[PDB]
Design a protein around this ligand. Structure first.
Ligand SMILES: CC1=N[C@@H]2[C@@H](O)[C@@H](O)[C@@H](CO)O[C@@H]2S1
Length: 504
Protein backbone atom coordinates (compact mmCIF):
# COMPACT_ATOMS: atom_id res chain seq x y z
CA UNK A 1 0.00 0.00 0.00
CA UNK A 2 0.96 3.61 -0.76
CA UNK A 3 1.05 6.46 1.76
CA UNK A 4 1.90 10.18 1.84
CA UNK A 5 2.12 13.29 4.02
CA UNK A 6 0.31 16.56 3.21
CA UNK A 7 1.96 19.44 1.39
CA UNK A 8 0.54 22.93 0.85
CA UNK A 9 -2.63 23.16 -1.25
CA UNK A 10 -2.06 24.11 -4.88
CA UNK A 11 -3.43 27.60 -5.59
CA UNK A 12 -3.86 28.53 -1.91
CA UNK A 13 -5.79 27.68 1.27
CA UNK A 14 -9.29 26.25 0.83
CA UNK A 15 -10.13 28.48 3.83
CA UNK A 16 -27.74 18.82 5.07
CA UNK A 17 -24.04 19.59 5.80
CA UNK A 18 -23.29 19.44 9.55
CA UNK A 19 -19.74 20.24 10.61
CA UNK A 20 -18.95 18.49 13.90
CA UNK A 21 -15.62 19.33 15.45
CA UNK A 22 -14.22 17.61 17.43
CA UNK A 23 -15.19 14.38 15.62
CA UNK A 24 -17.71 12.50 17.81
CA UNK A 25 -17.44 8.78 18.68
CA UNK A 26 -20.28 7.93 16.26
CA UNK A 27 -22.40 9.83 13.77
CA UNK A 28 -24.86 8.26 11.35
CA UNK A 29 -27.39 9.95 9.09
CA UNK A 30 -30.81 8.56 8.15
CA UNK A 31 -33.65 9.61 5.87
CA UNK A 32 -35.49 12.88 6.47
CA UNK A 33 -34.92 16.07 8.46
CA UNK A 34 -36.03 18.15 11.42
CA UNK A 35 -36.94 21.76 10.77
CA UNK A 36 -36.37 24.38 13.43
CA UNK A 37 -39.28 26.85 13.14
CA UNK A 38 -40.37 30.02 14.97
CA UNK A 39 -42.75 27.97 17.13
CA UNK A 40 -40.06 25.63 18.51
CA UNK A 41 -39.55 25.32 22.26
CA UNK A 42 -36.73 23.73 24.24
CA UNK A 43 -38.06 21.18 26.72
CA UNK A 44 -35.93 20.19 29.70
CA UNK A 45 -36.22 17.25 32.12
CA UNK A 46 -33.82 16.02 34.81
CA UNK A 47 -34.05 13.27 37.43
CA UNK A 48 -35.20 15.68 40.12
CA UNK A 49 -36.26 19.32 40.33
CA UNK A 50 -32.72 20.55 41.09
CA UNK A 51 -31.31 18.91 37.98
CA UNK A 52 -34.23 20.13 35.88
CA UNK A 53 -33.46 23.69 37.10
CA UNK A 54 -29.82 23.35 35.98
CA UNK A 55 -30.95 21.94 32.62
CA UNK A 56 -33.34 24.90 32.33
CA UNK A 57 -30.37 27.30 32.54
CA UNK A 58 -28.52 25.27 29.89
CA UNK A 59 -31.67 25.39 27.73
CA UNK A 60 -31.84 29.17 28.08
CA UNK A 61 -28.18 29.50 26.97
CA UNK A 62 -28.98 27.35 23.91
CA UNK A 63 -32.16 29.40 23.16
CA UNK A 64 -30.13 32.61 23.35
CA UNK A 65 -27.67 31.28 20.71
CA UNK A 66 -30.46 30.00 18.45
CA UNK A 67 -32.51 33.20 18.73
CA UNK A 68 -29.56 35.44 17.75
CA UNK A 69 -29.25 33.93 14.23
CA UNK A 70 -32.81 32.71 13.54
CA UNK A 71 -34.47 35.85 14.89
CA UNK A 72 -36.84 33.52 16.74
CA UNK A 73 -37.85 33.72 20.39
CA UNK A 74 -37.46 30.11 21.39
CA UNK A 75 -38.33 29.71 25.06
CA UNK A 76 -37.62 26.89 27.50
CA UNK A 77 -40.16 24.67 29.26
CA UNK A 78 -39.69 22.36 32.25
CA UNK A 79 -41.54 19.30 30.94
CA UNK A 80 -40.81 15.76 29.79
CA UNK A 81 -43.61 15.99 27.20
CA UNK A 82 -42.01 17.71 24.22
CA UNK A 83 -44.24 18.65 21.36
CA UNK A 84 -43.55 18.09 17.61
CA UNK A 85 -40.80 20.49 16.43
CA UNK A 86 -39.20 20.69 19.91
CA UNK A 87 -35.66 20.31 21.11
CA UNK A 88 -35.62 18.07 24.19
CA UNK A 89 -32.77 18.06 26.72
CA UNK A 90 -32.81 15.30 29.33
CA UNK A 91 -30.61 13.47 31.83
CA UNK A 92 -33.24 10.77 32.48
CA UNK A 93 -31.79 7.39 31.43
CA UNK A 94 -28.33 8.57 30.34
CA UNK A 95 -25.92 5.90 29.13
CA UNK A 96 -23.45 5.72 32.07
CA UNK A 97 -20.68 4.42 29.80
CA UNK A 98 -20.55 7.92 28.26
CA UNK A 99 -19.48 9.51 31.58
CA UNK A 100 -20.03 13.06 32.86
CA UNK A 101 -19.35 14.83 29.55
CA UNK A 102 -20.89 12.27 27.17
CA UNK A 103 -24.27 12.30 25.46
CA UNK A 104 -26.51 10.78 22.80
CA UNK A 105 -28.04 13.21 20.33
CA UNK A 106 -30.80 11.86 18.12
CA UNK A 107 -32.62 13.95 15.57
CA UNK A 108 -35.88 12.70 14.07
CA UNK A 109 -38.36 14.51 11.80
CA UNK A 110 -40.41 15.66 14.80
CA UNK A 111 -37.80 16.10 17.55
CA UNK A 112 -34.21 16.73 18.58
CA UNK A 113 -33.42 14.72 21.73
CA UNK A 114 -30.18 15.10 23.67
CA UNK A 115 -29.80 12.45 26.38
CA UNK A 116 -26.93 12.80 28.84
CA UNK A 117 -25.79 11.51 32.27
CA UNK A 118 -25.23 14.98 33.73
CA UNK A 119 -26.06 18.62 32.88
CA UNK A 120 -22.40 18.99 31.85
CA UNK A 121 -22.94 16.41 29.08
CA UNK A 122 -26.06 18.26 27.91
CA UNK A 123 -23.91 21.37 27.59
CA UNK A 124 -21.19 19.58 25.58
CA UNK A 125 -23.86 17.92 23.42
CA UNK A 126 -25.40 21.35 22.71
CA UNK A 127 -22.09 22.32 21.04
CA UNK A 128 -22.63 19.45 18.59
CA UNK A 129 -26.29 20.44 18.11
CA UNK A 130 -25.16 23.90 16.96
CA UNK A 131 -22.86 22.22 14.43
CA UNK A 132 -25.73 20.08 13.02
CA UNK A 133 -27.72 23.18 12.06
CA UNK A 134 -26.72 24.95 8.84
CA UNK A 135 -23.83 27.36 8.72
CA UNK A 136 -25.47 30.70 9.47
CA UNK A 137 -26.77 29.47 12.83
CA UNK A 138 -23.56 30.72 14.48
CA UNK A 139 -24.13 34.29 13.31
CA UNK A 140 -24.64 36.89 16.04
CA UNK A 141 -27.24 38.68 13.90
CA UNK A 142 -30.38 37.38 12.16
CA UNK A 143 -29.75 35.32 9.02
CA UNK A 144 -32.43 35.23 6.34
CA UNK A 145 -32.96 32.86 3.43
CA UNK A 146 -31.65 29.79 5.24
CA UNK A 147 -33.99 26.95 6.18
CA UNK A 148 -33.03 25.84 9.67
CA UNK A 149 -32.80 22.10 9.09
CA UNK A 150 -31.08 19.19 10.81
CA UNK A 151 -30.63 15.83 9.06
CA UNK A 152 -32.19 12.78 10.69
CA UNK A 153 -29.17 11.55 12.62
CA UNK A 154 -27.77 9.60 15.53
CA UNK A 155 -24.70 10.67 17.50
CA UNK A 156 -23.08 9.13 20.55
CA UNK A 157 -20.10 10.86 22.07
CA UNK A 158 -17.72 11.22 25.01
CA UNK A 159 -14.22 12.63 25.50
CA UNK A 160 -10.94 10.66 25.37
CA UNK A 161 -9.26 13.02 27.91
CA UNK A 162 -10.76 14.68 30.98
CA UNK A 163 -8.62 17.81 30.76
CA UNK A 164 -8.84 19.80 27.52
CA UNK A 165 -7.62 23.29 28.20
CA UNK A 166 -6.61 26.65 26.85
CA UNK A 167 -4.13 28.95 28.55
CA UNK A 168 -4.17 32.67 27.92
CA UNK A 169 -1.19 34.82 28.93
CA UNK A 170 -2.66 38.16 30.11
CA UNK A 171 0.65 39.24 31.68
CA UNK A 172 2.71 39.92 28.50
CA UNK A 173 -0.18 41.86 26.98
CA UNK A 174 -3.37 42.59 28.82
CA UNK A 175 -6.80 41.62 27.48
CA UNK A 176 -10.11 42.98 28.76
CA UNK A 177 -12.75 41.00 30.61
CA UNK A 178 -14.87 41.07 27.41
CA UNK A 179 -11.93 39.83 25.33
CA UNK A 180 -11.29 37.00 27.79
CA UNK A 181 -14.99 36.05 27.99
CA UNK A 182 -15.09 35.95 24.18
CA UNK A 183 -12.12 33.54 23.99
CA UNK A 184 -13.70 31.35 26.69
CA UNK A 185 -17.00 31.40 24.76
CA UNK A 186 -15.39 30.48 21.41
CA UNK A 187 -13.28 27.70 22.95
CA UNK A 188 -16.37 26.26 24.73
CA UNK A 189 -18.00 25.63 21.30
CA UNK A 190 -15.18 23.18 20.56
CA UNK A 191 -15.58 21.33 23.90
CA UNK A 192 -12.60 22.97 25.58
CA UNK A 193 -13.44 22.49 29.29
CA UNK A 194 -10.53 24.18 31.12
CA UNK A 195 -9.24 27.73 31.06
CA UNK A 196 -5.82 28.48 32.60
CA UNK A 197 -5.16 32.22 33.24
CA UNK A 198 -1.51 33.20 33.38
CA UNK A 199 -2.14 36.24 35.61
CA UNK A 200 1.41 37.33 36.45
CA UNK A 201 4.82 37.45 34.91
CA UNK A 202 7.85 39.73 34.53
CA UNK A 203 6.06 42.47 32.55
CA UNK A 204 2.84 42.64 34.55
CA UNK A 205 0.71 41.57 37.51
CA UNK A 206 -3.00 41.22 36.62
CA UNK A 207 -4.97 40.33 39.76
CA UNK A 208 -6.02 42.63 42.60
CA UNK A 209 -4.46 41.50 45.93
CA UNK A 210 -5.94 43.73 48.64
CA UNK A 211 -3.18 43.02 51.18
CA UNK A 212 -0.45 44.04 48.68
CA UNK A 213 -2.11 46.89 46.73
CA UNK A 214 1.03 48.00 44.89
CA UNK A 215 0.94 44.78 42.83
CA UNK A 216 -1.77 46.66 40.89
CA UNK A 217 -0.79 50.27 41.61
CA UNK A 218 2.74 49.66 40.30
CA UNK A 219 2.89 46.11 38.94
CA UNK A 220 -0.09 46.27 36.53
CA UNK A 221 0.84 49.59 34.89
CA UNK A 222 2.70 48.19 31.86
CA UNK A 223 3.17 45.20 29.59
CA UNK A 224 5.51 44.04 26.79
CA UNK A 225 6.28 47.01 24.55
CA UNK A 226 5.20 49.73 27.00
CA UNK A 227 1.40 49.75 26.45
CA UNK A 228 -0.61 50.80 29.53
CA UNK A 229 -1.28 47.26 30.86
CA UNK A 230 -4.38 46.69 33.00
CA UNK A 231 -5.72 44.29 35.64
CA UNK A 232 -8.74 42.39 36.95
CA UNK A 233 -10.33 43.42 40.23
CA UNK A 234 -11.35 40.46 42.37
CA UNK A 235 -14.95 41.20 41.28
CA UNK A 236 -13.92 41.00 37.58
CA UNK A 237 -12.11 37.74 38.22
CA UNK A 238 -15.21 36.31 39.90
CA UNK A 239 -17.21 37.44 36.86
CA UNK A 240 -14.83 35.53 34.52
CA UNK A 241 -15.12 32.44 36.75
CA UNK A 242 -18.92 32.72 36.71
CA UNK A 243 -19.00 33.15 32.91
CA UNK A 244 -16.77 30.08 32.49
CA UNK A 245 -18.92 28.09 34.95
CA UNK A 246 -22.02 28.62 32.71
CA UNK A 247 -20.02 26.77 30.08
CA UNK A 248 -18.82 24.02 32.50
CA UNK A 249 -15.31 25.40 32.22
CA UNK A 250 -13.01 25.25 35.21
CA UNK A 251 -10.78 28.31 35.62
CA UNK A 252 -7.31 27.62 36.94
CA UNK A 253 -5.50 30.82 37.97
CA UNK A 254 -1.68 30.90 37.78
CA UNK A 255 0.61 33.01 39.93
CA UNK A 256 4.02 32.11 38.54
CA UNK A 257 6.76 31.55 41.13
CA UNK A 258 9.61 31.66 42.07
CA UNK A 259 10.65 32.76 38.57
CA UNK A 260 8.81 35.10 36.18
CA UNK A 261 8.22 37.41 39.14
CA UNK A 262 9.66 40.78 38.03
CA UNK A 263 6.29 42.56 38.25
CA UNK A 264 5.98 41.65 41.94
CA UNK A 265 9.66 42.55 42.48
CA UNK A 266 9.05 45.92 40.83
CA UNK A 267 6.07 46.60 43.15
CA UNK A 268 7.63 45.84 46.56
CA UNK A 269 11.29 46.50 47.31
CA UNK A 270 11.16 44.26 50.39
CA UNK A 271 10.81 41.27 48.04
CA UNK A 272 14.36 42.01 46.79
CA UNK A 273 17.68 41.37 48.64
CA UNK A 274 18.66 45.06 48.44
CA UNK A 275 15.21 46.25 49.54
CA UNK A 276 14.81 48.30 46.34
CA UNK A 277 12.07 47.88 43.75
CA UNK A 278 13.14 46.46 40.39
CA UNK A 279 12.56 48.65 37.36
CA UNK A 280 9.52 47.44 35.38
CA UNK A 281 10.44 45.35 32.31
CA UNK A 282 8.78 45.71 28.87
CA UNK A 283 11.14 43.44 26.88
CA UNK A 284 10.54 39.72 26.22
CA UNK A 285 13.54 38.14 28.00
CA UNK A 286 12.86 35.25 30.38
CA UNK A 287 14.59 33.36 33.22
CA UNK A 288 16.26 36.21 35.10
CA UNK A 289 13.88 36.94 37.99
CA UNK A 290 13.49 35.21 41.34
CA UNK A 291 11.78 35.55 44.65
CA UNK A 292 14.12 35.28 47.65
CA UNK A 293 13.87 31.56 48.46
CA UNK A 294 15.28 31.82 51.99
CA UNK A 295 13.46 34.93 53.27
CA UNK A 296 10.30 34.53 55.36
CA UNK A 297 8.84 37.70 53.77
CA UNK A 298 8.66 35.72 50.49
CA UNK A 299 6.43 33.09 52.10
CA UNK A 300 4.27 35.72 53.83
CA UNK A 301 3.79 37.38 50.43
CA UNK A 302 2.92 34.01 48.78
CA UNK A 303 0.49 33.16 51.58
CA UNK A 304 -1.37 36.49 51.28
CA UNK A 305 -1.66 36.04 47.53
CA UNK A 306 -2.82 32.43 47.83
CA UNK A 307 -5.28 33.30 50.63
CA UNK A 308 -6.96 36.00 48.54
CA UNK A 309 -6.94 34.03 45.28
CA UNK A 310 -8.29 30.84 46.92
CA UNK A 311 -11.16 32.87 48.41
CA UNK A 312 -12.30 33.89 44.90
CA UNK A 313 -11.32 30.84 42.81
CA UNK A 314 -13.57 27.81 43.29
CA UNK A 315 -11.39 25.41 41.23
CA UNK A 316 -9.69 22.88 43.54
CA UNK A 317 -6.47 23.82 41.66
CA UNK A 318 -4.08 26.74 41.75
CA UNK A 319 -1.23 26.89 39.25
CA UNK A 320 1.99 28.11 40.89
CA UNK A 321 4.10 28.06 37.72
CA UNK A 322 7.69 27.00 38.43
CA UNK A 323 9.01 27.43 34.87
CA UNK A 324 12.40 28.93 33.92
CA UNK A 325 13.63 29.69 37.44
CA UNK A 326 17.11 30.23 36.02
CA UNK A 327 18.07 32.65 38.80
CA UNK A 328 17.10 30.13 41.51
CA UNK A 329 19.46 27.31 42.49
CA UNK A 330 18.23 23.68 42.20
CA UNK A 331 18.37 23.32 46.00
CA UNK A 332 16.42 26.59 46.53
CA UNK A 333 13.84 25.72 43.89
CA UNK A 334 13.18 22.33 45.48
CA UNK A 335 12.74 24.03 48.87
CA UNK A 336 10.70 26.95 47.57
CA UNK A 337 8.24 24.89 45.56
CA UNK A 338 7.72 22.49 48.47
CA UNK A 339 6.97 25.39 50.83
CA UNK A 340 4.49 27.08 48.55
CA UNK A 341 2.77 23.74 47.87
CA UNK A 342 2.28 23.35 51.62
CA UNK A 343 0.77 26.88 51.74
CA UNK A 344 -1.63 26.17 48.83
CA UNK A 345 -2.71 22.84 50.40
CA UNK A 346 -3.40 24.67 53.72
CA UNK A 347 -5.80 26.88 51.79
CA UNK A 348 -7.58 23.82 50.39
CA UNK A 349 -5.93 23.95 46.94
CA UNK A 350 -3.96 21.34 44.96
CA UNK A 351 -0.99 22.71 43.01
CA UNK A 352 -0.37 22.62 39.27
CA UNK A 353 3.16 23.53 38.13
CA UNK A 354 5.26 23.57 34.93
CA UNK A 355 8.10 21.06 34.74
CA UNK A 356 10.48 20.71 36.56
CA UNK A 357 8.15 21.47 39.54
CA UNK A 358 7.22 17.76 39.98
CA UNK A 359 10.81 17.16 41.16
CA UNK A 360 10.21 19.20 44.35
CA UNK A 361 10.44 16.96 47.39
CA UNK A 362 7.41 18.87 48.68
CA UNK A 363 5.07 17.81 45.87
CA UNK A 364 2.27 15.32 46.70
CA UNK A 365 0.46 12.81 44.50
CA UNK A 366 -2.37 15.40 44.36
CA UNK A 367 -0.02 17.90 42.69
CA UNK A 368 -0.28 18.09 38.90
CA UNK A 369 2.57 18.45 36.42
CA UNK A 370 2.13 20.57 33.32
CA UNK A 371 4.64 18.92 31.07
CA UNK A 372 5.76 21.44 28.46
CA UNK A 373 9.32 20.25 27.85
CA UNK A 374 8.14 16.76 26.74
CA UNK A 375 11.63 15.26 26.83
CA UNK A 376 12.56 11.65 27.70
CA UNK A 377 13.24 12.53 31.36
CA UNK A 378 10.49 15.12 31.95
CA UNK A 379 7.96 13.98 34.57
CA UNK A 380 10.04 11.09 35.85
CA UNK A 381 9.24 12.48 39.32
CA UNK A 382 5.53 12.99 38.56
CA UNK A 383 5.24 9.38 37.34
CA UNK A 384 6.99 7.97 40.43
CA UNK A 385 4.79 10.12 42.69
CA UNK A 386 1.50 9.17 40.93
CA UNK A 387 0.86 12.77 39.84
CA UNK A 388 -1.54 13.47 36.95
CA UNK A 389 0.10 15.07 33.91
CA UNK A 390 -1.22 17.74 31.53
CA UNK A 391 0.73 17.81 28.28
CA UNK A 392 1.68 20.93 26.34
CA UNK A 393 4.17 19.88 23.65
CA UNK A 394 5.39 22.05 20.76
CA UNK A 395 2.18 20.94 18.97
CA UNK A 396 0.10 22.76 21.64
CA UNK A 397 2.24 25.92 21.73
CA UNK A 398 -0.23 27.92 19.68
CA UNK A 399 1.87 31.09 20.00
CA UNK A 400 4.36 29.56 17.51
CA UNK A 401 4.30 30.99 14.00
CA UNK A 402 2.33 28.93 11.48
CA UNK A 403 5.28 29.41 9.05
CA UNK A 404 8.64 31.14 8.75
CA UNK A 405 6.86 34.19 7.32
CA UNK A 406 4.06 34.55 9.92
CA UNK A 407 3.62 38.24 10.85
CA UNK A 408 3.20 37.40 14.57
CA UNK A 409 4.30 34.56 16.84
CA UNK A 410 7.49 33.00 18.21
CA UNK A 411 9.56 30.12 16.88
CA UNK A 412 11.70 28.68 19.66
CA UNK A 413 9.70 25.42 19.33
CA UNK A 414 9.78 25.65 15.52
CA UNK A 415 6.68 26.44 13.47
CA UNK A 416 3.26 25.03 14.32
CA UNK A 417 0.78 25.01 11.45
CA UNK A 418 -2.72 23.48 11.58
CA UNK A 419 -1.39 20.06 10.52
CA UNK A 420 1.33 20.01 13.22
CA UNK A 421 -1.30 21.13 15.79
CA UNK A 422 -3.30 17.99 14.78
CA UNK A 423 -0.70 15.27 14.04
CA UNK A 424 0.31 14.12 17.51
CA UNK A 425 -0.95 12.20 20.53
CA UNK A 426 -0.58 12.93 24.25
CA UNK A 427 1.20 9.57 24.68
CA UNK A 428 3.91 10.95 22.33
CA UNK A 429 4.94 13.55 24.96
CA UNK A 430 5.28 11.20 27.97
CA UNK A 431 5.20 7.44 28.39
CA UNK A 432 4.03 5.51 31.48
CA UNK A 433 2.11 8.48 32.93
CA UNK A 434 -1.42 9.14 34.14
CA UNK A 435 -2.20 11.63 31.40
CA UNK A 436 -4.95 13.95 32.66
CA UNK A 437 -5.11 15.74 29.33
CA UNK A 438 -3.94 18.46 27.01
CA UNK A 439 -3.47 22.19 27.31
CA UNK A 440 -3.01 24.60 24.40
CA UNK A 441 -0.86 27.55 25.56
CA UNK A 442 -1.28 31.00 24.04
CA UNK A 443 1.64 33.07 25.35
CA UNK A 444 1.35 36.73 24.33
CA UNK A 445 4.87 38.18 23.83
CA UNK A 446 3.88 39.17 20.29
CA UNK A 447 0.07 39.36 20.48
CA UNK A 448 -1.41 42.79 21.19
CA UNK A 449 -4.96 42.71 19.78
CA UNK A 450 -7.97 40.42 19.76
CA UNK A 451 -7.35 39.91 16.02
CA UNK A 452 -3.87 38.48 16.89
CA UNK A 453 -5.41 36.01 19.35
CA UNK A 454 -8.02 34.93 16.75
CA UNK A 455 -5.39 34.52 14.04
CA UNK A 456 -3.20 32.22 16.19
CA UNK A 457 -5.96 30.24 17.96
CA UNK A 458 -8.01 29.63 14.83
CA UNK A 459 -7.73 27.15 13.29
CA UNK A 460 -4.88 25.80 15.54
CA UNK A 461 -7.00 25.31 18.62
CA UNK A 462 -9.50 23.27 16.60
CA UNK A 463 -6.71 20.74 15.96
CA UNK A 464 -5.69 20.63 19.63
CA UNK A 465 -9.36 20.36 20.71
CA UNK A 466 -9.82 17.25 18.54
CA UNK A 467 -6.58 15.70 19.89
CA UNK A 468 -8.07 16.13 23.41
CA UNK A 469 -11.57 14.84 22.61
CA UNK A 470 -11.43 12.31 19.76
CA UNK A 471 -9.80 8.91 20.32
CA UNK A 472 -6.47 8.50 18.50
CA UNK A 473 -7.77 5.59 16.39
CA UNK A 474 -10.46 7.89 14.96
CA UNK A 475 -8.11 10.81 14.16
CA UNK A 476 -6.80 11.28 10.63
CA UNK A 477 -5.39 14.50 9.14
CA UNK A 478 -6.90 13.95 5.67
CA UNK A 479 -10.33 13.57 7.31
CA UNK A 480 -9.90 16.56 9.67
CA UNK A 481 -8.55 18.80 6.90
CA UNK A 482 -11.62 18.23 4.71
CA UNK A 483 -13.94 18.71 7.73
CA UNK A 484 -12.09 21.93 8.55
CA UNK A 485 -12.63 23.29 5.01
CA UNK A 486 -16.35 22.55 5.50
CA UNK A 487 -16.27 24.33 8.86
CA UNK A 488 -14.64 27.50 7.50
CA UNK A 489 -17.89 29.48 6.91
CA UNK A 490 -18.76 28.87 10.57
CA UNK A 491 -15.53 30.52 11.72
CA UNK A 492 -16.38 33.49 9.46
CA UNK A 493 -19.93 33.61 10.86
CA UNK A 494 -18.63 33.76 14.43
CA UNK A 495 -16.52 36.83 13.58
CA UNK A 496 -13.28 34.94 14.18
CA UNK A 497 -10.32 36.56 12.42
CA UNK A 498 -8.70 33.16 11.72
CA UNK A 499 -5.65 32.45 9.57
CA UNK A 500 -6.53 30.85 6.22
CA UNK A 501 -3.82 28.21 6.54
CA UNK A 502 -2.47 27.12 3.10
CA UNK A 503 -2.08 23.53 4.38
CA UNK A 504 -5.88 23.28 4.63
C1 LIG B 1 6.72 27.25 30.41
C2 LIG B 1 6.76 28.52 29.57
N1 LIG B 1 7.79 29.48 30.02
C3 LIG B 1 7.99 30.51 28.95
C4 LIG B 1 6.77 31.46 28.78
O1 LIG B 1 6.77 32.48 29.80
C5 LIG B 1 6.72 32.13 27.39
O2 LIG B 1 7.83 33.03 27.22
C6 LIG B 1 6.76 31.05 26.30
C7 LIG B 1 6.66 31.58 24.88
O3 LIG B 1 6.51 30.49 23.97
O4 LIG B 1 8.03 30.35 26.44
C8 LIG B 1 8.32 29.67 27.67
S1 LIG B 1 7.25 28.18 27.85
Amino acid sequence: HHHHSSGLVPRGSHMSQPSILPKPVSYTVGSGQFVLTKNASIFVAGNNVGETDELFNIGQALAKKLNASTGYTISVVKSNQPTAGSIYLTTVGGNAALGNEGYDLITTSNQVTLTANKPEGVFRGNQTLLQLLPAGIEKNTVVSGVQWVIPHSNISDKPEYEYRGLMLDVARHFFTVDEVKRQIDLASQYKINKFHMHLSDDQGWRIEIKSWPDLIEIGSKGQVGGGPGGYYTQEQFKDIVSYAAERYIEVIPEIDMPGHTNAALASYGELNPDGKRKAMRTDTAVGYSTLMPRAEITYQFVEDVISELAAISPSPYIHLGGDESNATSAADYDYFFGRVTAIANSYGKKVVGWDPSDTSSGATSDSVLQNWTCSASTGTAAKAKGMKVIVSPANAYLDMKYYSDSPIGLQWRGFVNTNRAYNWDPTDCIKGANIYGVESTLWTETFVTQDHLDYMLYPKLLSNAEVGWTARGDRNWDDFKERLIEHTPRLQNKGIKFFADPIV
